[PDB]
């Protein structure tokens, strides 16, 4: 007797006709099309959001395990967190720090040579440089990025107010840190520079430290609460001390408003790379200019790097006229190649060949002539050292560590700081010093979590057959003392797309779920990701997207068949592209799943191109307005494939979405929740929408909101699957 669902107005006439290769045309009905109108523009959308919000709150709050979860999460989340040390041109190391339950990581610094005094029981040490929590009253304003002037006197930084893809760029002196005395709701100590209407932090200082390049868009009233396509990306140069109105236009392309464009300077500041993107594929239109020839503006001598739309190019470094690129040019797994700007017609020369069995994730220069490569092989990271001059192998480092690495250190430094993490390791900072034949490794600092004994857990590697017989890898994290007797709950997380690998990643909350509910945490490395190189992505996109859903369903069947999980206690979870996975799998195999968690899900696979950044995803999903693509998209589009109610028991489903979410428009969740509640008015399992009116994502917003969302998710799974919380 948790019902009834709040009513939702239907438009029974609303339909769009799509061209179809098989059927000539298909008229598709959308009775909830009015919920495409943003919250702030429609009283109907407002009434839907408020009624669904209130309904979900009432259901979630009637479970006593919700408060129990909130308390469990507050205790366990209260641990000291930090990044590796990042060396900067002002002669300081910078590091992120959280004392425990602050919304945003704070930026601390220490004089190079004094770093052995930081991150102790006494506290972070060094000096507090920047506290993003001070920027807002709610802790929802976040640092989107930062870059120091080459001179080391200035610091350019991005702030997004409500966690949307809108930010302003500020500048402050490196002599002007945030003082501890200062209170919330202000950014004291900044210079007057304010760069508005930015949607991504790609910022390059000129070597004269007089100004920086940036990308911006036309102004927008509904600041991240609109859902119009993101259009008319422009490159500008800002001179320090000038109003944004004086900024010089570097590039615009009015013919192609859907293109995204940015510039990047080589570390020397001599060469500028222009890159335009027309979709989510790893392909660019690229141009190089030599800043020793040009004054900044629309009068720069742009040179051809390579034919457009064949490859992506990222700067690794430069040596005079030679530029080092990480590129996928005739190499889908990426490689390192050099360009001589003095011989453009010779094109690119291979320095490090493509590895046919490993995705090259990053390439960086250290100790003058050591090339550090991070490879993704078999769904985890490997570090290889190469000679910059010859490309000759100089050996592996951190081979004994299975997980992922974040590498800090510049070409002029003999040292790197490497943050290692996995499903079981929250964060170990190693220091590595390059030598002639071998280096020196030391453990600098390790994150400890008082609230949880990590030795109680194990991560295994299994391989399971998908529907088509493809062998898929899965990671299984679990408590060592849990019996595989077919009674355990599972939390099964998937994404499957955009060459994004699900690599070993530390999540405290997930391990608390495993301990408290005696549960298994399953990460199937399904197609669409880069776990087995770029071909793994190709086998899970466009007309092969169904492979992703089949891989995920087969993972669940395997866990049940091999007694890892109860048939009655499978919870699946996914976000963004992961939401196509959760909603498709719920439609295609509702009987496998007891609980489905969808975070900012993409669900309407016909209408996705019409909103914010959606048109770029046509490279991944296909173009719904193309007759050939329409047929394979329409087969799985979860919004259009909700099972007929008479012979399906739909799982319990909880949808998270945000008001400022301009990445995936909330309308996806709005319409699907409306449709599910309409199809299954009597459940028996509830379909709920949990909305945050004050963020545009679910990480790097207020700790209060994050705790409540997690307490809602875990308490909802507990209720839906009939679980008891263990001490
Ligand atoms: C989440 O998975 C959504 C839905 C499908 C793909 N996607 C993304 O967020 C993709 C994947 C990586 C980044 N991305 C994206 O949309 O970036 C475009 C962009 C957004 C904001 C500024 C600049 C570019």
Residue numbers in the entry: 5 to 731
Excerpt from the paper describing this PDB structure:
OphP tolerates sequence promiscuity in the substrate but has a preference for highly α-N-methylated substrates and for N-methylated glycine residue at the catalytic site. The promiscuity of OphP is explained by structural analysis of co-complexes which reveals a predominantly hydrophobic substrate binding cleft with few interactions between substrate side chains and OphP.
We determined the covalent complex structure of OphP with ZPP by soaking wild-type OphP crystals with 5 mM ZPP overnight. The structure of the complex was determined at 2.0 Å resolution. Additional electron density, which we fitted as ZPP covalently linked to S580 (**Figure S11**) was seen in two subunits. The other two subunits had weak electron density suggesting low occupancy. The overall structure of the OphP:ZPP complex is largely unchanged from the apo structure of S580A (0.5 Å over 716 Cα atoms) (**Figure 4-Figure supplement 2**). There are differences in loops Leu139–Ala146, Ser164–Met171, Ser179– Met195, Pro222–Gly230, Leu696–Ser706 and Ala622–Tyr664. As a result, His701 has moved closer (7.6 Å to serine) to both Asp665 and Ser580 to form the catalytic triad (**Figure 4-Figure supplement 2**). The benzene ring of ZPP is located in an aromatic hydrophobic pocket. These results confirm Ser580 as the key catalytic residue and suggest a structural re-arrangement of active site residues including His701 upon substrate binding. The OphP:ZPP complex has a proline group at the P1 site which results in Ile606 adopting an unfavorable conformation ([Fig fig5]).
